[PDB]
Amino acid sequence: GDRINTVRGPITISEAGFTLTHEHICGSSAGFLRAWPEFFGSRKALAEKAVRGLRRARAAGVRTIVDVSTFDLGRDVSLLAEVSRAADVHIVAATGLWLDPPLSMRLRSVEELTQFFLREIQYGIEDTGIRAGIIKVATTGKVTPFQELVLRAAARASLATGVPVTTHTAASQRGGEQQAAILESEGLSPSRVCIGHSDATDDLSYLTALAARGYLIGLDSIPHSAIIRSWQTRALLIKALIDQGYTKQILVSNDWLFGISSYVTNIMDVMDSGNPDGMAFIPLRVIPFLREKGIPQETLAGITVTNPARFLSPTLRA
Amino acid sequence: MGDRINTVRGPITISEAGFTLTHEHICGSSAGFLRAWPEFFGSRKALAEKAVRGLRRARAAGVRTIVDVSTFDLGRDVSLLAEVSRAADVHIVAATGLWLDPPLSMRLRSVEELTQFFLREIQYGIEDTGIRAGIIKVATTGKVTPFQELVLRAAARASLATGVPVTTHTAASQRGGEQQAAILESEGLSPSRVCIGHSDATDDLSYLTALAARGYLIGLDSIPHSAISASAHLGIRSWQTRALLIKALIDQGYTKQILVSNDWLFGISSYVTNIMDVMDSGNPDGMAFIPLRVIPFLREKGIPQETLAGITVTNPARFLSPTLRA
Numbered sequence: 293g294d295r296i297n298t299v300r301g302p303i304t305i306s307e308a309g310f311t312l313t314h315e316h317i318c319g320s321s322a323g324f325l326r327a328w329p330e331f332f333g334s335r336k337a338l339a340e341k342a343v344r345g346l347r348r349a350r351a352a353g354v355r356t357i358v359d360v361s362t363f364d365l366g367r368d369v370s371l372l373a374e375v376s377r378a379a380d381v382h383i384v385a386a387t388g389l390w391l392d393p394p395l396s397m398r399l400r401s402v403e404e405l406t407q408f409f410l411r412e413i414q415y416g417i418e419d420t421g422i423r424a425g426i427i428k429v430a431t432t433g434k435v436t437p438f439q440e441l442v443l444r445a446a447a448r449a450s451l452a453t454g455v456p457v458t459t460h461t462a463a464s465q466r467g468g469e470q471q472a473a474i475l476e477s478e479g480l481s482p483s484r485v486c487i488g489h490s491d492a493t494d495d496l497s498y499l500t501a502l503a504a505r506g507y508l509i510g511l512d513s514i515p516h517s518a519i520i521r522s523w524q525t526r527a528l529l530i531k532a533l534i535d536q537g538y539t540k541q542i543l544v545s546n547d548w549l550f551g552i553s554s555y556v557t558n559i560m561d562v563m564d565s566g567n568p569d570g571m572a573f574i575p576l577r578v579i580p581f582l583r584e585k586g587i588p589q590e591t592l593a594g595i596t597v598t599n600p601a602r603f604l605s606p607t608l609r610a
Numbered sequence: 611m612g613d614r615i616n617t618v619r620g621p622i623t624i625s626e627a628g629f630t631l632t633h634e635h636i637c638g639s640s641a642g643f644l645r646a647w648p649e650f651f652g653s654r655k656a657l658a659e660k661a662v663r664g665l666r667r668a669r670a671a672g673v674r675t676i677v678d679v680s681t682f683d684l685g686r687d688v689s690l691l692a693e694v695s696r697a698a699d700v701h702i703v704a705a706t707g708l709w710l711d712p713p714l715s716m717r718l719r720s721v722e723e724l725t726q727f728f729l730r731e732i733q734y735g736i737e738d739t740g741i742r743a744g745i746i747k748v749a750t751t752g753k754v755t756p757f758q759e760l761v762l763r764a765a766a767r768a769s770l771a772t773g774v775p776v777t778t779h780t781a782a783s784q785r786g787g788e789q790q791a792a793i794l795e796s797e798g799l800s801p802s803r804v805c806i807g808h809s810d811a812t813d814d815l816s817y818l819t820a821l822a823a824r825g826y827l828i829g830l831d832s833i834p835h836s837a838i839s840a841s842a843h844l845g846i847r848s849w850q851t852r853a854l855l856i857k858a859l860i861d862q863g864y865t866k867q868i869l870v871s872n873d874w875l876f877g878i879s880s881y882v883t884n885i886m887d888v889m890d891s892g893n894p895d896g897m898a899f900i901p902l903r904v905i906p907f908l909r910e911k912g913i914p915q916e917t918l919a920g921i922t923v924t925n926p927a928r929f930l931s932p933t934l935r936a
């Protein structure tokens with residue numbers, strides 16, 4: 293133990309089950325949900341939609357999701373705890389920073405950012421006692437100077453705790469290469485890192501090189517195509533990496549959410565009509581699509597159960 | 611409305627406000643930051659206790675009310691305001707609006723949506739506290755951005771629907787007040803509902819008097835910032851220079867347009883670490899700087915006691931009093 297922190301407390305890795313490693317309850321901004329809950333109809337309406345959505349995902353086999361909403365994505369761990377309890381789905385909460393850090397974060401040193409990430413992992417988030425079980429970082433283009441500080445702080449928090457790092461990248465710009473250079477310079481093992489949004493390219497050699505270095509490859513936005521590139525085209529990247537022998541490097545998810553304020557108004561209605569399966573898109577469409585392309589059950593179980601368990605269990609490090 | 615002002619302890623009558631500092635902060639931060647990382651300030655309790663000591667000392671020096679012009683995106687925590695207002699027994703008026711650091715969920719909103727957010731905070735309450743804003747704070751860069759113009763129009767519509775005043779953050783060295791006033795007036799807002807803030811950062815009396823002559827309130831609100839080289843041997847600019855702008859505006863006949871404040875804080879995270887120690891070293895009086903140093907300096911220049919009382923009492927009362935909506 294080696295246990296994984298969830299918003300309801302620690303769980304053993306055998307409890308994690310079928311895990312979606314990149315999801316959101318709500319994509320927002322710090323403070324926003326509590327200051328303007330009517331933007332989502334109400335806090336109650338958002339909670340009830342998320343409960344129904346997680347209960348839908350649970351009925352399709354999901355047992356754990358990783359909500360990679362950070363501070364600056366408006367993460368509200370008390371909402372996560374509520375919907376987790378009512379849906380009987382484990383939710384792992386995140387620390388780190390995404391692409392919208394306020395001034396009080398932008399002006400911090402790497403040492404200070406490290407103590408904030410560590411506080412959220414070791415002590416708890418806000419006054420809730422809920423501890424993060426993953427560190428989420430986002431970078432753009434070439435890593436900005438501040439984004440490099442965040443990566444180094446993330447590496448340092450991970451190295452003290454064994455909790456893994458998952459990233460937001462622009463795959464069309466091959467952004468994981470710069471992320472990997474920085475994280476390795478800190479001494480972080482690639483086996484502690486998921487390079488996410490990696491399904492947003494056709495450049496397989498970029499993904500294969502990262503997997504061959506030990507990185508987990510986050511093919512985590514497949515339903516976003518379903519809203520030229522078909523979602524089945526993105527799904528075939530999973531088979532491509534399987535076929536090259538890197539199934540133990542693959543993590544798959546929807547990158548879905550149940551409310552969104554960090555974008556144009558009503559985008560949630562467009563997203564939901566584009567993907568009515570929500571977070572069940574992965575188990576209900578991608579998994580059977582991979583099966584009829586000849587992927588065996590043992591491999592799919594490895595990807596959806598074994599890999600997330602290894603990824604999320606704190607190590608220390610191989 | 612009429613003769614009642616919303617505070618973090620609930621409504622009070624005009625007469626209760628007394629000596630009022632119209633531009634102050636308990637904590638200069640970011641949305642969510644204080645609750646997510648209180649040990650940045652030592653602890654929430656350590657920050658509350660520092661604010662309470664500070665407000666008590668300002669109260670001993672005569673202060674009865676501060677206006678905390680911290681917006682959502684300056685990390686306003688009205689629960690913290692209410693706690694320290696009650697412990698110090700000093701009225702605190704809370705703000706809505708948006709400052710210079712709106713997150714994505716604010717940056718992508720329409721004017722109609724921002725108008726609703728501001729109305730929510732004035733008419734219903736901030737977050738789930740029931741505490742209603744008594745002022746609308748807006749900030750612009752020198753030249754107003756498209757989003758900042760949206761914020762100004764929403765602030766005007768909220769002010770016109772509720773009667774609560776608007777107070778602004780400007781770059782005085784770029785005459786920021788003039789672009790703001792033009793946008794506000796294009797929405798039909800009276801200049802008498804608007805304070806143009808940080809106006810003591812300039813020595814351009816022509817800029818200050820023209821705004822005053824249109825009925826704007828002039829926020830000479832950061833006097834002690836001057837109290838703490840460069841390559842060109844530039845020097846600082848003393849706090850007495852800033853304070854003499856008060857006398858200048860009195861001598862031009864615009865006594866009734868002057869608001870005076872410290873723009874102080876008891877914690878700050880929206881700046882490089884350790885700026886708070888530097889500020890407290892430079893101005894140990896905190897928010898008491900106005901009553902303990904500025905008032906006697908102006909008295910010493912022949913300004914009558916009753917003129918100083920009108921500036922620090924009557925002008926804020928007239929400005930804060932909700933004005934115009936049946």
Ligand SMILES: CCCCCCP(=O)(O)Oc1ccc2ccccc2c1
Nearest residue numbers: 316319320460547552553554555559
């Ligand atoms: C800016 C959208 C708020 C949620 C961002 C979370 P993400 O970095 O994982 O990826 C997303 C997630 C949802 C999106 C919806 C519309 C457009 C782009 C989107 C990108």
Ligand SMILES: CCCCCCP(=O)(O)Oc1ccc2ccccc2c1
Nearest residue numbers: 635638639779873874878880881885
């Ligand atoms: C920029 C972080 C300070 C919070 C904003 C307060 P303000 O914009 O109303 O005026 C001040 C108030 C205090 C300040 C202290 C150091 C640097 C800048 C300052 C600006």
Ligand SMILES: [Zn+2]
Nearest residue numbers: 430460461489
């Ligand atoms: Zn992302």
Ligand SMILES: [Zn+2]
Nearest residue numbers: 314316360547
């Ligand atoms: Zn995401």
Ligand SMILES: [Zn+2]
Nearest residue numbers: 749779780808
């Ligand atoms: Zn300001």
